[PDB]
């Protein structure tokens, strides 16, 4: 069963890489949402207040 164990190991390694790419996506989604937040806080909120 050494061959099947090695296949399972390599499949999980690929799944782990899939999760790492999702982790990268989420990190950039944070950057994107923070950008929208900063713009609202700095440009739109004062505009409404004045």
């Amino acid at each position: 069963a050494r061959s099947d164990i090695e296949k399972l190991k390599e499949a999980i390694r690929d799944t782990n890489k899939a999760v790492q790419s999702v982790q990268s996506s989420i990190g950039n989604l944070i950057v994107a949402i923070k950008s929208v937040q900063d713009y609202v806080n700095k440009e739109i909120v004062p505009s409404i207040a004045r």
Binding site: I12, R13, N16, V19, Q20, Q23, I26, G27, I30, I33, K34, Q37
Partner: peptide, 20 residues
Amino acid sequence: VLNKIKSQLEESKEWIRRSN
């Protein structure tokens, strides 16, 4: 909320390191 998103992303990366 943004800091919670980041904290959970960092925990996710640790679990992958341990799996690997």
